[PDB]
Design a protein around this ligand. Structure first.
Ligand SMILES: Nc1ncnc2c1ncn2[C@@H]1O[C@H](COP(=O)(O)O)[C@@H](O)[C@H]1O
Ligand SMILES: Nc1ncnc2c1ncn2[C@@H]1O[C@H](COP(=O)(O)O)[C@@H](O)[C@H]1O
Ligand SMILES: Nc1ncnc2c1ncn2[C@@H]1O[C@H](COP(=O)(O)O)[C@@H](O)[C@H]1O
Ligand SMILES: Nc1ncnc2c1ncn2[C@@H]1O[C@H](COP(=O)(O)O)[C@@H](O)[C@H]1O
Lengths: 425, 425, 425, 425
C-alpha cells in the first residue's frame, strides 16, 4: 500500500525528537561540564550534528531536541549553528528543556517521561510519524528509507536494529525477529545477551532509533505515564509493551545507511567509554577513514566558526615541524613540533619542541614548550605547563590524571589545577 | 577622565545582562505558561524586545539573557528573532538558564544569585562595564549615554533613577541623592516611600538598570555569595552595600531617554498589574501614542514572522466592517464586525456580527459569531464560542473568568475549558 | 524505470534556472524601472517569489536567476529574502547577470542565449535534470511530480502544457500531442492558434516550463549557438528542434498543480497586460480567492519585512473608517476613509475623507485628503495631492495618466510630476 | 562643534560607497575572470572584506558596493558572506550595478559617473556624510576617527593622505598641505611626483578614501556631470575642483589606523602589480606578520565556508610531510610533501613528493605527484600535471606561463590548457 510519490511526503508529515537528555556516565570526566551530545568530535563537530544533519538530508526539517543535563554548551551550539530556519516553511529546531515553575519541580524522571511533559507542544505540530532519535550516537542514516520500510509493512512502531558483537551486547536493546521482521522477544540491556540465529558470536541490538505512528505514541505515553511501577523509558518499559502486542517491526540499518563504499560495513560508534571516543576521532586521521567526511552527497552541518588558517611556524631554533596522519583545524598555531596520529581542534596553540602522538587536543588547548604527549585526551582550555610528560609512565599518570584500563589518559583543567598549575592563560 | 572617542569605545568594552528571570505574580494568569519578558505587546512584540533593541542601538551587541521560569516561549523567541549574530564580530545573545545536574540542583536562589552561578562564563567575555538590565520593562533608553555619565563621574555603580508618584513608589527602589548625584540613602520596596525634596508627591525610584565596574561586581557578588543571611538580590542586598560605602551614583533617565517629542515626559511602563498591561497596549491604538513605534532612528527588532496581509471581508449578510482607532496586525481575518480601541495581534480570526471595544486579542484567537467584548484581554489561542458576552455584566464576568478590581477581564483557555467550551481547533 | 525512492533523489540531482530576464512591454509604465518578476503582487510578494517557493517546496534548492533588465530591485530582493542558504548543504540562489567587460559586450542576445553565456558555470553544478522556469508567472506547481513524469516516460525534454482559450492562445507556444503525450507539432506564438481535438474553443499552450536532460541541453545550445539564423529562444528555436526529432513530451499541469480545492481548475496567470495585473490582485481581496495564500502545506517565501501593525485611526472629524473585502498589509495608516475591493501594500498612508474602490496601492503611497480613487493602480511612492479624482471621467484620465482600453488607470510619479505635483514627501 | 556623543552619532548619519568598480590592469591575468576587489587574499579572504569590515567596526552599517567588471564572483561573495543584515535596523549592503534597459546603454564612464548614475538611490538613504571608499585596497582603518576629524575641522571634503616613497608616487594622488591640514595643491597621477617638505624621498599621497558632506557631493557631481571636458573621476576631476575652492582638508592615516603594535608604521598595500600580491600574502606566513589577523578587537568578516580540518597524510612511501612558515587553510589534503613559505587556500590537494617554496595556491588547486614549485601564483582550480617544474628555469617559465620582471610566475587554466594539459578534474 505504497504510492509512487510516498517517499517525499512522509518526511514532510514527520517530526524528529532527539533525546539529547542525560549523559554518558562511562565518560568519567569528559562530560562533567556538558552533555554527551555536545562532546566535541571530528575537529569541528559535536555529536549532535550527526543526529541533526540526517534529519535535514532526509527531508525532516522539524526536530525536537530534549535537553536536561548541562545543556548550556548544547543550547548555545544549537543557537549558533542550527538557527538558520524560517518557521513559515514548516521547519524548526525546538528546544524543550524541562519547564521549571515551582521551587524544584519538573525534572524529567525518564527518557519516556521527557516526551510526556512536552506532549502538549508536540500535538501542536500535527505530525503523523514521530522519529525518536538518540542523539548521543554517531552515524550516517537516511530516515526517509526507514519511514518507508515502516509504511510498507503497515507497522505501528519500527525499531532500527543492527547486529553487534555479543561481548558489547549487554549495553543495548537485544531483540529477536522473524521472517517478516516482526519483533518476537525484546529485552533491554540484559546480563546474558542472547545471540542471533546462525551467528552465535553476535546479537541483534537496538540502536535507540524508534519510528512511531503518532496516534499510537500519544496513546502509549498517556497509558504509561499513569503506571506507578514503570521506569519511564522507551527500552525498559514501552518497547516491551509494543512487542508483546505484536505491533513492533525491525528495520535493518544496512538498508538505510549512507556510505560511500558499498563493500564496507555500516558505521556505528556510540562513544560509550573513553577509549572508544579516542579511537573514534583518530579513525578520521588515518589514511582511509571508516567515516567519510569529505562527502558532498550527505554533508554534516555544524557551527561554521570564523577561524584563520592553520599556521605552522618555525620554533625558537628556526627548525621545521613534521606531521604524519593528523588533522589540524583552523586557528591552530604549531611552532615547529612533531605531531603524529593526532586531531587538533580549533585554536590549539602548540609551542616549540613538543612531541604529540595519538592525541586528541580539544579546542583552545595551550601546549607548553618541551611537552611529550602519548595516548591522551586533553580537554577544553587546558593550559599544559612547560616540560609536562604524559603517556610514558602509567604509574605516574594514574595518580595525577585519569587513566583508563586500556591506557588512555584524560586531562582536564581541574586535574591540572589540583597539581598547582595555573589555568588562566 | 573622558576622551574624544570615548563615546564609541565603551559599548564595545561592555556587556549587558538581561534578568528575564522570574515572573510578575501580579499578572494573575497572563504568565502561568510564560515568563513576564515573553508577554506579548504592541501587536507583534514581546517585552524583552525593548530591553534588547536598546542594547543594539546603543552599540552593546554582547547580551546575556538569564532565564529561569517558563522560558520555552522566551528561548524560542530569542532563537528566531535574535540569532542573526556572528560570534566573530564580538556579538552574541547567550542564554544562561540554570545548569541542571543530578536532577534537582542549581535553581537560582535570587536575582543576584543568577549572575553568580554564571560568573565563570561572564569573566570569559572580558568586559569592563556590566550593564544589569531588568528586561520585564518597557522603555526606549540609550545606554551609551548612561555609560558616559558613569565614565564621566568616576563611579563604581550607577543606578538609573526616575521620579514616579509616591502612590506607586512602594514597589520600586526609592533612593535619595545630593548635588553631585551621589546616592545617600537607598531602601528597597519601603512601606512608606520617602518623597523627594521640593516634590512631596513623587519619589526618586530605581528602574532596575545598574551599570557596574566589572572589577567591582565580581568582587561584590563573591563577597555576598558567602553571606548565609543575605537574600541574594541587587536591590535588597547589594545596592545598599554599595551605597553605604559611597560608591553609588544616580543617572537621571530623562537624559538618556530616546523620544521623538522633546516636549514630552519620558515613557516608562513596567506592566505591573493586569490593568496597566491593557492600558499600555491601547495607548498605541490612540491617535497620538505616548510610545512612538513608527520611529526609524530607534527601531525595535523582533521575530519578523511571515504572515499574509490583514484581510477584511464581508459578513454573512454582505455588510461592511467598521474600525476606529485600532491596530490589526498581519494574518488577521475580520469578517465585517465593529472593532474599536482594540489591538489585534497576528492570526486573529473574527467571524461575523461581533462587537469589540477596548479589547486586546493576543495571537491565534478565534472569536465566534455574534460576540460582544468590552474591556478584556483574550489570551493566546482562546477559542471564544458563539454568542459569548464579556464586559457588560461584572457580576457574571467575575465568576466565569478573572476580573480585576478596576474592571478589566482576562480570558484564558483554562477558564473557557472549565465552562465546557472545547478548545480543540 | 520507477524505483521506490526515485521521488526524493531527483530534486537533489536537479537545478532550476529562472529566466527573470527581460520585461513585459505589455505593462506600459509599471515596469519602466524594474523587471517584470519584481513587479509587486499580493500585498507583500513579488512575482519571482512564486517561481522560487515552488523550487523549495519541490525539493529543488539549487536555483539560477538570470537577470538582465532593471535588476536592482530584483537583486536586492533576492539578497534580502532569498539569502538564507548555506552552500555546504548543496543549496543556493546564484544570480547570473550578463558578465560585463570592455564596457560594451555580453548583453544576452536571447532567452536561450542567456543559458549559454553561463554554461561554464552550470556545468560546475553537476546537475542531471535542468528545469527551465519562466519566473514572470504566477502559479503553485510541484516540480517533483513533473520530474517523475519526466523520468518515468523516458523523455529528453518535457514541456508543461495546459489548455487556454483560443482567444489568448496567440501569446503562448501552442502544441499538439498524441496518446502517449508526445509533442507532434509545436509552433511558437502563432497568429491563428490551432485548437485542440474535441475542444474547438481552446488550445494546448506551453507555459514556459521545460525540464531537460542536462546532457541533451548542453549539446543542444552549443549546437544552436553556432547557428547564424537562429533567434536564440527556447520557444522560437529549440523546442521545434527537439520536437522534430520526436524527443519532446508533454506534462499536463493539472497533475502537478498544488491546489487546496481539488474540484477547482488550475490557477495560471501570466500577468500579461495591465488589466490582468489589477484583476489578479483583487482576486485575493474577494471572499473566496482563486489563489490560496493562507495555505500552510505550500507556503510562499518572501521578504519578511519588519513593519508595525496596520493602524486605523479616526479622521479630522472623529469619524469611523469603513472597509469591505480589502487587504491592508503592515505599516499602513488609514485615517477614517472608505476602502472597498482594494489591496494596500506596505507603508500606504491614507489621510482623511478618501474614497477608494477596486484600487491597488503599491507601497509607500501617500493619498491626500479628500481623494476619490476608482479602478486604478497607484505605483510605488506616488504622492497623490489633495482633492485628486481618478476613475470618474475617462476622458480626463486618459490625458493625465495612462488608461487602458478596459478602463484601468495607472498612476506613476513621472505622470504626477509632469502635472506639477511635487513627489518628494 | 565637539558635542559629548558626536563620536557615536556620525556613523549612523553616514553612508559608505565602495567603488569595487573596475579592475587592476597591472594584474596581467589574475583578474581576467573577476574584479580586483574579489581577488583572493589571506587564505580565506577577498580584498573587499577589508574595505567592508572597517565600515562595520567603525559603526557604518550602510554600504553601497558599485560593481561593473566581472562581478559574478564579487556579487556571489557579498550574497553569501555579507547578507546577514536586517534593513529595519538601518543597515544594508546595497549592490549598485549599472542599469541595463534597452540594448547596451548605461556603462559607467568613470569612477565619479557611477555615483551619479545611482544618485536617485543614495538620496533615499538620507545620509549627511558620504564616505567614498576604494575597495581594491588592503588596510585596517577606523572611519569613526576620520569622520570626527572631518567634523572638528569644519570641512566639506576630507581626503585621507599617507606618505609613500616617491618612486611609487606616480600611481596615486599626490597633494600638498599646510599647518591646518588644508589641501593647497592636488595633482592626480603626475609623471614627476612632487616631494614632501623636509622628506625629499617621499610624497604625500591620497589613498582613495574621501569623506564628503552629502549636500556638497550631490551638488558637485550634478555640477560636473553636465561638463563636456570632464573625465568623470574623483581624483582627475572633482578633488582638484574642491581644492581650488579651498574646501578640501587632509586627514593623516596614522591617526585613524588600527594596529596592535603602536611602534610600527601603518599598513597599506594596494596590491598593484603581481609582485606585491605575492609578497603581501607571504607576509602572513612569516613569524611576525605586518598585518595582524589574529586580532579580536578589529576582526575581518568574510564568507565563513564550511570546510573540514586540514588533513596531512603519509605519501605513497609512508613518509612524513614537512612544513615551515606556511598557512594551510581548511579542506586541504597534503600527502607528505615539503611546503615552505607558502599560503594554501581552501580545498588545495597536494599529492606526494611535491616541493613547494614561496608559493601561493589559490583555492581548489590540484598539484600532481612529483611537482616542484618556486616563486609562483597558482590560480583558481588549476590542475597541475605530474612532474611539472616551475620557478627553476626562467627562460622556460616565460614562454609557457606569465613571468613578471621580478621573477614571479603566474599559472592559470588557460595557460595550462594551451600546453595540452586537461583541466577538468
Ligand atoms: N576558554 C575557556 N576557558 C575555560 N572554560 C571554558 C572556555 N570555553 C568554554 N569553557 C567551558 O568549558 C565547558 C565545556 O564547554 P565546551 O567544551 O564548549 O562544551 C563549559 O563549562 C564552558 O563554559
Ligand atoms: N495555537 C496554540 N494553541 C494552544 N496553545 C498554544 C498555541 N500556541 C502557543 N501555545 C502555548 O501557549 C503558551 C504561551 O505561549 P506564548 O503565548 O507564545 O508565550 C505556551 O504553553 C505555548 O505552548
Ligand atoms: N520611496 C521611494 N521613492 C521613490 N522611488 C522609489 C522609492 N522606493 C523605491 N523607489 C524606486 O522605484 C523603482 C521601483 O522599485 P520597486 O518598486 O522596489 O521595484 C526603483 O527605481 C526604486 O529605486
Ligand atoms: N572549480 C572551478 N573550476 C573552474 N573554474 C572555476 C571553479 N571555481 C570557480 N571558477 C571560475 O573561476 C573564475 C574566478 O572565480 P573566483 O576565483 O571565485 O573569483 C570565475 O569564472 C569562476 O566561475
Amino acid at each position: 500500500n505504497d504510492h509512487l510519490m510516498l517517499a517525499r511526503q512522509l518526511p514532510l508529515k514527520s517530526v524528529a525528537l532527539i533525546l539529547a537528555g542525560g549523559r554518558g556516565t562511562r565518560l568519567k570526566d569528559l562530560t562533567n561540564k556538558r552533555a554527551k551530545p555536545a562532546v566535541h568530535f571530528g575537529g569541528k563537530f559535536r555529536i549532535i550534528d550527526f543526529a541533526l544533519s540526517n534529519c535535514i538530508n532526509s527531508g525532516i526539517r522539524r526536530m525536537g531536541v530534549i535537553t536536561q543535563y548541562q545543556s548550556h554548551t548544547l543550547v548555545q551550539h544549537i543557537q549558533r549553528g542550527w538557527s538558520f530556519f524560517n518557521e513559515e516553511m514548516n521547519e524548526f529546531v525546538d528546544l524543550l528543556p524541562a519547564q521549571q515553575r515551582m521551587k524544584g519541580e519538573n525534572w524529567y524522571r525518564g527518557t519516556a517521561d521527557a516526551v510526556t511533559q512536552n506532549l502538549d507542544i508536540i500535538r501542536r505540530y500535527k505530525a503523523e510519524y514521530v522519529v525518536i532519535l538518540a542523539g548521543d550516537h554517531i552515524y550516517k542514516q537516511d530516515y526517509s528509507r526507514m519511514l518507508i520500510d515502516h509504511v510498507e509493512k503497515g507497522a505501528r512502531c519500527t525499531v532500527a536494529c543492527m547486529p553487534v558483537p555479543i561481548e558489547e551486547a549487554s549495553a543495548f536493546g537485544v531483540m529477536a525477529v522473524d521472517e517478516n521482521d516482526k519483533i518476537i522477544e525484546f529485552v533491554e540491556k540484559p546480563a546474558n545477551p542472547p545471540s542471533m540465529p546462525n551467528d552465535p558470536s553476535k546479537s541483534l541490538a537496538s540502536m535507540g532509533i524508534y519510528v512511531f505512528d503518532a496516534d499510537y505514541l500519544y496513546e502509549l505515553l498517556e497509558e504509561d505515564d499513569r503506571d506507578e511501577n514503570s521506569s519511564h523509558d522507551f527500552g525498559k518499559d514501552l518497547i516491551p509493551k509494543i512487542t508483546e502486542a505484536g505491533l513492533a517491526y525491525a528495520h535493518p540499518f544496512p538498508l538505510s545507511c549512507v556510505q560511500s563504499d558499498p563493500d564496507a560495513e555500516p558505521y556505528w560508534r556510540d562513544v560509550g567509554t573513553l577509549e572508544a571516543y579516542w579511537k573514534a576521532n583518530l579513525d578520521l586521521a588515518s589514511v582511509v577513514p571508516e567515516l567519510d567526511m569529505y562527502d558532498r552527497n550527505w554533508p554534516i552541518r555544524t557551527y561554521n566558526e570564523s577561524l584563520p588558517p592553520a599556521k605552522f611556524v618555525q620554533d625558537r631554533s628556526g627548525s621545521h615541524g613534521m606531521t604524519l596522519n593528523s588533522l589540524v583545524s583552523g586557528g591552530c598555531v604549531i611552532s615547529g613540533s612533531v605531531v603524529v596520529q593526532s586531531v587538533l581542534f580549533s585554536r590549539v596553540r602548540v609551542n616549540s619542541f613538543c612531541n604529540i602522538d595519538s592525541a586528541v587536543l580539544l579546542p583552545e588547548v595551550w601546549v607548553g614548550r618541551s611537552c611529550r604527549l602519548r595516548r591522551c585526551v586533553i580537554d577544553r582550555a587546558c593550559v599544559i605547563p612547560e616540560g609536562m610528560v604524559i603517556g610514558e609512565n602509567a604509574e605516574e599518570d594514574a595518580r595525577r590524571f585519569y587513566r583508563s584500563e586500556e591506557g588512555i589518559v584524560l586531562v582536564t583543567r581541574e586535574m591540572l589545577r589540583k597539581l598547582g598549575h595555573k589555568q588562566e592563560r
